[PDB]
Curated annotation (Swiss-Prot):
Family the entry assigns: Belongs to the peptidase A1 family.
EC number: 3.4.23.22
Keywords (A to Z) from UniProt: Aspartyl protease, Disulfide bond, Hydrolase, Protease, Signal, Zymogen
Keyword check for Signal: yes
Domain Peptidase A1, first and last residues per copy: 17-328
Organism for this UniProt entry: Cryphonectria parasitica
MF GO annotations: aspartic-type endopeptidase activity
The protein's name: Endothiapepsin
Coiled-coil regions, chain positions: none
Amino acid sequence: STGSATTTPIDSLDDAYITPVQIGTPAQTLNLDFDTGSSDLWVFSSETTASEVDGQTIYTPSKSTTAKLLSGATWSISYGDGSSSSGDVYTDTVSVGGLTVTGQAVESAKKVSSSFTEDSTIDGLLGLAFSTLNTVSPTQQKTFFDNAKASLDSPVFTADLGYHAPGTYNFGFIDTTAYTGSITYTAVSTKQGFWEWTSTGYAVGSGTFKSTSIDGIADTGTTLLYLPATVVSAYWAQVSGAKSSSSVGGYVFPCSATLPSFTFGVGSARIVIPGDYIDFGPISTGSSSCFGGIQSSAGIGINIFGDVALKAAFVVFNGATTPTLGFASK
Ligand SMILES: c1cc(CNc2ccc3c(c2)OCCO3)ccn1
Ligand SMILES: Cc1cc(C(=O)Nc2ccncc2)c(C)o1
Ligand SMILES: CNCc1ccc(Oc2cccnc2)o1
């Protein structure tokens, strides 16, 4: 089997991407944030505290003839940015782009933090990291990909995120029309539960490539590119007026600037992020200071190849017996 679904930016800055997902019988379609950095499929629901729902579409398990309470199971998750959610668990039929899993754990939110309530466009998350990170207790649950894998034509999914435009998540096949050149595959460590790999270096604009190993994770659920402070300083030093602002929480730059590109290495291959992908617009409405899309990972504890990086590439998440990651230009 295969599946193919379009993923769409939630706003004009590509702050996150939503993909329609069918849950239950008859189908209830919710727009979920596919997150290769976490491993829980959770949704706003008829159980979510009413004051914490503000425009989201909710899953109502009592209206699904295939929903079953997973008795005694609870979940609770906190993401790197301070947001969080928690609740109980159902199993139900879940379909993405024509690919169906029966008995998928659908984690129903009883509580969500304020930034989830504030994102009316995001009805929940669909985790695509390794199932060892799933938070369901006392019986840990598998991701949608993990459950689908044996039925797929090939044990893979691909992320093809757009810049200011829709893109695609495919399951079970590699669309050879969606990228240019060849796909370069690179080793993955699953020891922390992430799609963790080592980039071979970077360049800023037209500058010479610096060969240096940068461990990090491929994370579709993180907006920005978070890299070591040395790398980030070298980037922003090429932008007149750019500075790290403690009050804003990162590097800012004059909105009048045209930004240089940023290249990262994948083996001997190179992925080029155009400068415009690094512009996250005014720090507050009407400001002429703009927020940078490359930020320091110092204090995160891990480097994160988030949407800013991934949307410059066609990315293969290869879930073969030994997982690997593939990157192609597009
Ligand atoms: C990246 C972007 C966002 C939301 N967008 C956004 C845009 C500009 C900003 C911002 C946030 O926060 C800092 C000030 O400037 C949230 C998380 N990562
Ligand atoms: C500003 C913001 C970020 C998030 C958010 O969900 N973070 C996030 C970060 C990493 N992985 C998954 C999710 C929210 C609700 O608001
Ligand atoms: C959470 N409300 C503020 C807001 C609007 C857009 C964004 O940015 C997001 C949202 C979700 C995930 N990652 C980044 O934050």
